[PDB]
Amino acid sequence: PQITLWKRPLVTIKIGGQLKEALLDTGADDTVLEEMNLPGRWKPKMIGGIGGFIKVRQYDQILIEICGHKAIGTVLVGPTPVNVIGRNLLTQIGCTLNF
Amino acid sequence: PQITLWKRPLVTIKIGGQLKEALLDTGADDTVLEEMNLPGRWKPKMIGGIGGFIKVRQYDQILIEICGHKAIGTVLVGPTPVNVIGRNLLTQIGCTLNF
Ligand SMILES: CCOP(=O)(COc1ccc(C[C@H](NC(=O)O[C@H]2CO[C@H]3OCC[C@H]32)[C@H](O)CN(C[C@@H](C)CC)S(=O)(=O)c2ccc(CO)cc2)cc1)OCC
């Protein structure tokens, strides 16, 4: 689809078999989701945002469906204020900016 | 134009008579720029993201030229680690997400 930006670009995602709402975020290199349970191994990582760094759980090669489009990539889970879909996955679904 | 998301969506902007590089950020409600001594009145504001909040100065009705496209709106100035063009201005240049 074509998504305008008058409102936050929020979409439904499916991860680990569960539905959630997430923000398409071209300013995020990586995808960061609020605290949740995901199966499989994970390793600790640090990521920095506008206000500092947070500790996240890095899950690699995770299946995630974004607005009906499949992706398999890295998903960071931690105390983010909002579920954000970053460029690592936006590229997989063929997302571009246009004006 | 069309901007793929393999790399950070960095573009040149013109603000207050100065040229800068900034990130086209669909995840930012409002525009946040690196410290710059702009003229005119302003109001204190706190904005939050990953890592917490930072203190910024809110200037209203500021003109920015983004890839030759003009836009006028609120600009937040403070110790941001990156120049971010938010939805308040991206809407004015006709920017959409497409996949
Ligand atoms: C030298 C480099 O500095 P740095 O590493 C951090 O640099 C960056 C800092 C921020 C960004 C942009 C933000 N992206 C981000 O958080 O991405 C994280 C995850 O993916 C990684 O990739 C890049 C960083 C990591 C996001 O797009 C927009 N935000 C809101 C969303 C979170 C929705 C709540 S918001 O900025 O907070 C914000 C809040 C309120 C307003 C007013 O309306 C305007 C902007 C990009 C790079 O310093 C370490 C301390």
B79 burial (CB, 10 Å; 0-12 / 13-18 / 19+) is exposed
CB A63 within 8 A of CB A70: yes
Which chain A residues touch B if contact means CB-CB below 8 Å?
Answer: 1-6, 8-9, 23-29, 32, 47-54, 67, 69, 80-81, 84, 87, 90-91, 93-99
Chain B positions in Cβ-Cβ contact with residue A8 (cut-off 8 Å): 29, 87
Point out which residues pair with B76 in neighbouring strands: B32, B58
From the CA of A24, how many Å to the nearest CA of chain B?
7
Question: Hey, what are B8's tokens?
Answer: 């950070």
A49: Cβ–Cβ under 8 A, 6 or more apart, which residues?
A80, B49, B50, B51
CA atoms within 13 A on the CB side of B14: 7
- How far CA B99 is from CA of A7, A68, A90, in Å, comes to 18, 11, 9
- Tell the residue nearest (CA) to atom 42 of ligand 1: B30
Q: For chain B, list residues whose CB is within 8 angstroms of any CB belonging to chain A.
A: 1-6, 8-9, 23-29, 32, 47-54, 67, 69, 80-82, 84, 87, 90-91, 93-99
Task: Tell me whether residue B25 is one of the annotated catalytic residues.
Answer: yes
SS (H, E, C) B24-74: ECCCCCCEEECCCCCCCCCEEEEEEECCEEEEEEEEEEEEEEECCEEEEEE
C-alpha–C-alpha distance, residues A92 and B81, integer Å: 27
Chain breaks in chain A (C to N over 2.5 A) after: none
Q: Quick count: other Cβ atoms within 10 Å of Cβ B98?
A: 12
Residue whose C-alpha is closest to residue B46's, from A50, A83, A71: A50
Cα distance between residue B56 and residue B28, in whole Å: 14
Within 6 Å (CB) of ligand 1, which residues are found?
A 23, 25, 27-30, 32, 47-50, 52-53, 81-82, 84, 86; B 25, 27-30, 32, 47, 49-51, 81-82, 84, 86
Question: What are the φ/ψ torsions at residue B36 (nearest 5 degrees)?
Answer: -155, 140
Phi, psi of B94 (to 5 degrees): 75, 30
> How many A from CA of B24 to the centre of ligand 1?
12
Would strands A69-77 and A52-66 be described as parallel, antiparallel, or unpaired?
antiparallel
Alpha helices per DSSP H over A12-97: 87-90
Residues B15-50 as b/e (b if ≥16 CB within 10 A, e otherwise) read bbeeeeebbbbbbbebbbbeeeebeeeeeebebebb
CA dist A32 and A45 (Å) reads: 12
